[PDB]
Design a protein around this ligand. Sequence first.
Ligand SMILES: Nc1ncnc2c1ncn2[C@@H]1O[C@H](COP(=O)(O)OP(=O)(O)OP(=O)(O)O)[C@@H](O)[C@H]1O
Ligand SMILES: Nc1ncnc2c1ncn2[C@@H]1O[C@H](COP(=O)(O)OP(=O)(O)OP(=O)(O)O)[C@@H](O)[C@H]1O
Lengths: 372, 425, 425, 372
Amino acid sequence: KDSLIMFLVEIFRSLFVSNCIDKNIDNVLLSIEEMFIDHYYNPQHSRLKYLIDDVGIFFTKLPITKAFHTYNKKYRITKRLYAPPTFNEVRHILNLAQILSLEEGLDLLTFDADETLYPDGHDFNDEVLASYISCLLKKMNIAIVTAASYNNDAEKYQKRLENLLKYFSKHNIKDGSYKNFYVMGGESNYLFKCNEEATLYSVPENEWRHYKKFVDYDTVQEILNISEKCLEKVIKDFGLCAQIQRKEKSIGLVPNKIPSLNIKNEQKNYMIKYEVLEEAVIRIKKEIIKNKITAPYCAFNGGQDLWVDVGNKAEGLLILQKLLKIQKKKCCHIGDQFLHSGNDFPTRFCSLTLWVSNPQETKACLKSIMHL
Amino acid sequence: DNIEDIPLGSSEQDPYDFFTLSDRNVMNSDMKKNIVQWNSRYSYNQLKNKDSLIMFLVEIFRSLFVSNCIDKNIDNVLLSIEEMFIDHYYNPQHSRLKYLIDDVGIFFTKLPITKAFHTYNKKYRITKRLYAPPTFNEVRHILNLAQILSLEEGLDLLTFDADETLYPDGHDFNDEVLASYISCLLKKMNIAIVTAASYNNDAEKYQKRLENLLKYFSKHNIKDGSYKNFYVMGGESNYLFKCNEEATLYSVPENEWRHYKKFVDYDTVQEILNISEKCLEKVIKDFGLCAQIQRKEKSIGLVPNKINYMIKYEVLEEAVIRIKKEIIKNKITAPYCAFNGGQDLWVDVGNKAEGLLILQKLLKIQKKKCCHIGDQFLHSGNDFPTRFCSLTLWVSNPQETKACLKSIMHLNIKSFIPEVLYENQ
Amino acid sequence: DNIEDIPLGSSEQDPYDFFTLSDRNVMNSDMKKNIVQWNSRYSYNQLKNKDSLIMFLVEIFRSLFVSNCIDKNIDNVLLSIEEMFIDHYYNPQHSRLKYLIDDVGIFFTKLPITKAFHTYNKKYRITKRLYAPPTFNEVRHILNLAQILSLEEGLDLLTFDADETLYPDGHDFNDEVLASYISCLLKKMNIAIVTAASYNNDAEKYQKRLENLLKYFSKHNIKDGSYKNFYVMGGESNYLFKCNEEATLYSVPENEWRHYKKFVDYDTVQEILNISEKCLEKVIKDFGLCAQIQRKEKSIGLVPNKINYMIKYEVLEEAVIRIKKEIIKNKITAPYCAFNGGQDLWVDVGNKAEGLLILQKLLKIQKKKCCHIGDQFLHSGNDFPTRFCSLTLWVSNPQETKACLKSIMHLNIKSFIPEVLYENQ
Amino acid sequence: KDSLIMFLVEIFRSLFVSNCIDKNIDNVLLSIEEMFIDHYYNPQHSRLKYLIDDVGIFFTKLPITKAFHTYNKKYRITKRLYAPPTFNEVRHILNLAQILSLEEGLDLLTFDADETLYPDGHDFNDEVLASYISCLLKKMNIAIVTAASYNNDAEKYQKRLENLLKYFSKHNIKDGSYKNFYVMGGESNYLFKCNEEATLYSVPENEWRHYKKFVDYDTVQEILNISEKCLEKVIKDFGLCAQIQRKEKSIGLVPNKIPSLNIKNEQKNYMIKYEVLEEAVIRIKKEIIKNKITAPYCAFNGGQDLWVDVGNKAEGLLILQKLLKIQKKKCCHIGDQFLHSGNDFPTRFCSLTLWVSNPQETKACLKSIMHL
Ligand SMILES: Nc1ncnc2c1ncn2[C@@H]1O[C@H](COP(=O)(O)OP(=O)(O)OP(=O)(O)O)[C@@H](O)[C@H]1O
Ligand SMILES: Nc1ncnc2c1ncn2[C@@H]1O[C@H](COP(=O)(O)OP(=O)(O)OP(=O)(O)O)[C@@H](O)[C@H]1O
C-alpha cells in the first residue's frame, strides 16, 4: 500500500515472531529513527531511499522511537502473544510520529472534507470534532479542501459546514480566529474565507490567481469534452440508466432515479457497478494521456457517481501555502487514503499527511495536535 | 451427514490478516471494501480462505482477460470447468476438482456454471471492460446464479444466518419487503433461522430480535398454516423455537430433537466457559479494557461498556486465539465456536453448522433440497465450512438478499432470468 | 520413536515448482543456484518447504538488515530466539516455536544459535555487507554450526545419505580425504550409510558403489576392529550390510533386525510395484520415451536408454504423481517412496527415515547421540521429515561435508572453532 | 524473471487447472498472437505494453500459436495431468517463436561465448555444436562475443576456440565462409576475423572505431581506479586472500592460491563467498553512479572472481550490426540469462535474444535455425 507502512509492519513481524517485541527493542527503533533522520537531511542519498524507492521526501525529523513507545504504552500491542502489530497500528504510529515531529509548530492544518468531515456524504455533524477544530483555529490557519463544485456560491458550501460554522459563531470571533479559516472548493478552483458573523464569503479570483498555474479555457473544455465522449460510450457499453452533468470546470456521470418495490421508498438511484465506474475512470485517464494534456486534473470514482474535475486537491494545498507564506515543514494535511485507489497526487509530496479512517481516529489525531 | 463428518476446526486459527479487512471500524463503507479487492497483495489470501472455489474462477478469468479473449467465445473453457463441476457432483471426493481445490466442499446439484456466466455477462457485460478484469464479487454473483439455476426440483428448506443477513448493523429485524419475500417463501418451503445469540431458553428475547418479521407473519402466514414451517435456532445449535397461531416463539421440547445433536456433557460445557472466563478476565486486565463479561448457560461474551466504549480489534483477535489455545491445552474436543464479532467476542458451546444438520434431520429434508443464505465475509470457514451441508448463497447486503429470494420465489418459471445483485433494476 | 509416529506423506505432493529449481540439467552450476536464491519470487516457497526453520531465521535477519542494525548488538534478538529453541527442546510439541513453525521437527539438543551466529559472523562478517542480507545458505551454515556446537556429550552414530553426500554425480565413491575423515570417525563412533539403490541382497553391487571407501578401511580400520562399526542400509530400509575382516560387505541375517522394521506383507509390496509398472508403461507410451523399466525385488525404476537419452524433467514429475495417485486410489498405506531423481525415477517399497530408526534401535543408540548428513536440496520433506530422527546437518557439496566431519572429529576440543563451509581456509 | 515468460506461464496455468489445456485452445493462443503482432506494429501503443510494462520492443512477428503447436506436438506437455507447463518450457516456446519469426531470414547470428560455447569455463569442446555453427556460417554472418580480455592478442583467443576453428579448417574455406566469422573480445573492445588458414587475426582499431561511441582514456582509467579502491576495501572488509589485477580496460578481484590437505591437490584457489562477490559488484555499481559516469561498462560476478570491463556485450552487438550494415529484424543473439543477475543491458533491446542453458538446448535452437 504505502510502502513505508509495509516496511515497518514486516520489521515488527520479525520482532514479534522472534519473541522479543515486548523486550527492549530500542536498538532497532533507534536504528530506524536515525535512518529516518538521515532522510530529513540529505534525502536524495539516504540509505532509506535505497531500500524503499517511493519514500518521497520527509519534511521533518520523525521521532519514530518515541512514537512507538507512546503508542505501545497506551494500547500495549507488544503484550499480544498471537496478534502481531497490524497495518493500521503502524499507520497510527507514523501518524503519531509526524505529529510530534512538529515541536517547532505548524501554521496550517488542512482537511480533506469529503474524506474526514462529512460522514457518509452528509453535512458536518460532530459537535466534538467542531470543538477541536475551533481550538486549533486559534493557534494556526485551518483550511478545508473539497471536490464539491458549486462555483463561487458561498451559501452552497455553507450548508455542508453550517454546524461547524455555527460552532465558530460562539467560540471564534471574540479572539478573531475566524480570519484563519479557509475553504477551497472545486479541488483548487473556488476559495472562501470567514466573516465576523460566521458566514462564508468568496475570495475573488483576482486576489489569489497569482499563486495558481493558469489553465487555458479551451484546455479545460477539451478535458471535459474528452470525458463527455468517454462517458457516453460507457453508458452505451453497459446499458446505464445515467446521464452526463456538465459544470464549468467539472463533468460527471450521475445515475438516474428509477422505481423500487411499492413497499419500499417509491424512488431510488440507479446503481452503477463499482467495476464499471473504475473502468470509466481510467478509460478517461488514458484518453487524457492520449491527448498529451499537462493540466492538473482529477478523475475519481466516488460512491454511486463519477466526477472529472479540472484541478486536484494537491494543487489546492500548494496554492494555500504559496498564499499564506508557509513552507512545507510547518503544515500538515488530514485525509483518508483507503478512499482513493488513484495513487496519483498522493498529497504527501506537498505537505505532511495524516491517514485517518473514522471520526474517532481524526479526533485522536487532533487531541495529539493540541498538546504540543 | 453428521457433525463428526464435517471438517470443523474449532480451535484452529486462520492465517493472520495484517490488514484487518474485517475490522468494520476501519473498512466501514462499500467504497473501501471494493478498493481492497483490487490490490491482490492486500486481500488475496483472505478472500481465497473464505471461498477458494471463487478465487479459483477469478484467477482463470484474470488470465482469459490478460490474454485478450474474455469477450470472445470462451465456451471451451467454461464447459470444461462445468464438466469438472458435474464430475465433482458425482464424486465429491477423489474428483479432479477436489484434487485442485481440497476445501471445495460438496456439490449437491449440477451447477450450470456456463449458463451462469452468460446470464450475468448478458446483463452486466463485464467482458466489455478493457481494464478491470472480473472481480471476486462478480464471480461470487456468478456462483450464486449457478446454484439458483440448479434448483430444478425446488427447495423444501431455506435457512438464513440471522446475524449475517437479517439484522442490519446488529439491530433488530427491520425490512418490510424482505419480510414479504420470506413470508411468501414460508408458504412454499420450510424456513429456519440460525443465530449465535444465546438468551438461554428465553423465547421472548429471541422474538424481540425478530419482532417485525413475526408481525408480518401474523398478517399473511397464519390463515394458511404456513407459520408451522418457521423455525429459529438460537445459541448456534442449543435452543430451538417454533411459531404458534399468535406469531409467538415457543421452545420445542428438547426431547423432540436432542437425539439429532451430538451430546456434550455438562462439565465440558462449563469447563469451556470457565476457561474462557479466566482468559477474558486476563485479557481485560492485560489491556486495561472497559469491558464486561456476559456469561450464559452455554456461552460467554466479551462486551464493551456503554458510554459505547470500543475494544481494539486486535485485542479481540488476540483473545479468540488465547481461548482456543487454552481449550486445546485442556484437550477439549467438543464442538464450540469462539469468534471475534466486529465489536465484541463470544464463545458459544455450539456450532451453526451442527445447527443446520439438526434442522435437516429434524425436518427430514434432503440436502439437495436445502439452501443457506449467509455472508462468508463475516465468518471463518473453520467454523462454518463452505458447502458442507447444503447449497450456500453468498450475500453481502440486503439488496443482494432480496434479489436472491425474489429469484427463488420465481424458481423454475420460464419467463424469469434469475438475479442476485439488484432487486429493482 | 517409531515409523508410525514420524510425519510421512508418502503419497503427498509438494506444491508445484513452476521454476523447476531441482532440474539439474538447467540449474547445473553453483553460480545459477546462488542467483535464484536472491529472487524471492523465484525460490521462496521451494526453500521454505525444505527447511521452514532456516527460512524463519532468514526473514528475521532480513528485517534486522533493512532496519540497519544487523551489525550492531543484536544479542537481544538472538538470545530470545535461543530461548525459544531451548524451550522447544524441553517441549517438542506445544512449544512457542512449534506454534510458529509447525513442521519445525525435534530438537534433541540445546542449540547455541547465538554462539553460532557470532562464530560464523566473526569469520565471514556477513553483517559488514551493506546490500546483500544474510542468505538461505548462510543461515543453513549457521544452523549446522549450532547443532555441531551442541554435541557436548559426543556422538555414537553418524549417518550419511550416500546418494546425496558420497557419490559425486552419481558415480562410485571417489574422494581420498573424505574417506580419511570417515575412517577416523569410524574409530570413534558407529557409521551407517543409507542409499535408495536396491541391488536386491547382492552385497557385491553395493560394495562396487563404495569400493574406494572400503579399500581405505582395509588400510586403517581393520587392525583396531573399527570395521565392525560400519553399516550399509540399501533399498532405503530393506537390505542391511556389515563389514568383515577383509573389508567386504556381507548381508546381516534378516532375523537379526527384521523386528525393528514395520512389517509390509508380500502382496502389498508387489501390488505397489505392479501398479507402478503399469503407470510407467503408460508414461512411456503417453510421451514416447526411449526408456526402460527396471524392476527389483522391492523397487521399480524408470531409467533412460544409453545412447544417455534424457527424459523430460516434467515427465518425471508427472509420473511420480501419477504413481502416488494410483497407489492412493488402491488404498495402500504402506510406507514407500516414489521420487524424481535428476534423470530417472524410482519407487522403493522402503523409506530412508525408517532406515535410520532401524539403525538406531539395532545399535541401541539414543537420538541425542545421532547425527545425519544429507542434502535437503535433493529430497522432499514428506519423504524424509526435517529433524525427525536425529540432529541433521545440511551439506550441499563435498567441501562442506569435509568441513563438518573435520569439526566433528575435533569435537569438544577447546582450541577448535568449528567450520561447516571450507576445509582448507 | 523475464515478465513475458511469467505472462504466459500464468495463462497456461489457468488453462491447465480449468482442464482444457489439452483441447482446442487456439482462441486463446491466436488472441495472444494478434496481441503480439499488434506489438510488432505500433509497439508504443499496444495493449501488450499496457499489460506488461518491461516488454521491450519486438523486432518481428512472433508466431506464438504455431510455436506452441510445434512444441506440444513433440513433447506433449498438454498430456500431463499434474505437471502444468513450466517456466523453462515457456522459455523454449518463445525461443522457438523467435526462430520461426525469421522466415525472411537473418544475416547475423551472435553467441555469448562465456555462457554457451565454453563449458564450465574451459575451451571449446563439442564437435557436434561446431558442426552446426559451420553449417550456419555458410548462410549468415556469425560473431562471437566474450568478456575475456587479452588485448588484441589473437593467439590467446584462438586457444579458447581452437577445436571450433579446427572444424572450420575442414568445412569452411572451399566456399569462403570464413570471411563471415567474427570474434569480439573485451565485451566490445577487440575485434578479430578469420583468415584462409582458420586462424584468428586482429581487425585494427581504426577500421571499426567509427561505429563505437568513443570513450576517453581518463574516464576508463577513472572507472578502473574507482573499482580499484572499492575492491581494496572489500578485501580489507572481509579478510580476503585475494589481490587486484589491472588490465588496460579491465580490473579484477582474483583469488590467491592457498594450500589444501596433503592428500588432496597441494594447491587450490582461495574461495570467495558468492555473497561477498555480489556485495562488491553493486558496491562498484553505486560508486560509478555516484561519479555520474555515462560510459557503458559491465561489472559481473563470474564464478570465483569479479571483473569490471569498460564496454558491455550489448554495445558490441550494436557495433557488429552497425559494421556489417544489418538492422535488428535480421539478427539474433544466443545467451543464458540465468547467468547474469545484473538485469542491466538485457541484450533483447539490441537484437532478438534466445535463452539457452545447456549445450543440448543450444543445438536444438540451431537445428531449428537450419531448417528455415
Ligand atoms: N496516531 C493515530 N492516528 C490515527 N488513529 C489513531 C491514532 N492513535 C489512535 N488512533 C485511533 O483512534 C481511536 C480513538 O482512540 P481512543 O478513543 O481509545 O483514545 P483517544 O482518542 O486518545 O481518547 P482518550 O484520550 O479519551 O483515550 C482508536 O480506535 C485508535 O485506533
Ligand atoms: N526452442 C527451444 N529453446 C531452448 N531449448 C529447447 C528448445 N526446444 C527444445 N529445447 C531443449 O533442448 C533439449 C534437446 O532436445 P532433444 O535432444 O530431445 O530434441 P532435439 O534437440 O530436437 O534433437 P532431435 O531433433 O534429435 O530430437 C531438450 O532438453 C529441450 O528441453
